[PDB]
Amino acid sequence: GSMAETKAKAEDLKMQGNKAMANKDYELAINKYTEAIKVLPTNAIYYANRAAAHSSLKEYDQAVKDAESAISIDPSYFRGYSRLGFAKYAQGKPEEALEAYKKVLDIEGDNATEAMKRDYESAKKKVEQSLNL
């Protein structure tokens, strides 16, 4: 049992989760990410992936919890904030979604992709729609 072998075991479970996500077996994906976390609980990617599986089942409270875990474990891993932003947006909390999506843009700066800016602009339009009612 080496640390690399433990990592490889968790990564294989993560890959099984990714396959389940690709097949839209979201319950199975949640299991595989959970099992990966139990094998190696210090990797924010597994939490962020589980948040995605929860969000796909519209379990946004569960997604928020995992996105916040990803952020706590690894504050510079920007996909944790993207998962948080999506879950909050879907909950109808667009100001909190805007802050999450803006944090992605602050981490990446001039490296930010057009997808990251689209997410930010979507949350912003929803915030502005809200205060314009």
């Binding site: 989760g17 995605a52 969000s55 999506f86 979604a97 949350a123």
Partner: peptide
């Protein structure tokens, strides 16, 4: 927004 691809 959309649930972006995992990882």
């Amino acid at each position: 927004p959309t649930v972006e691809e995992v990882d």
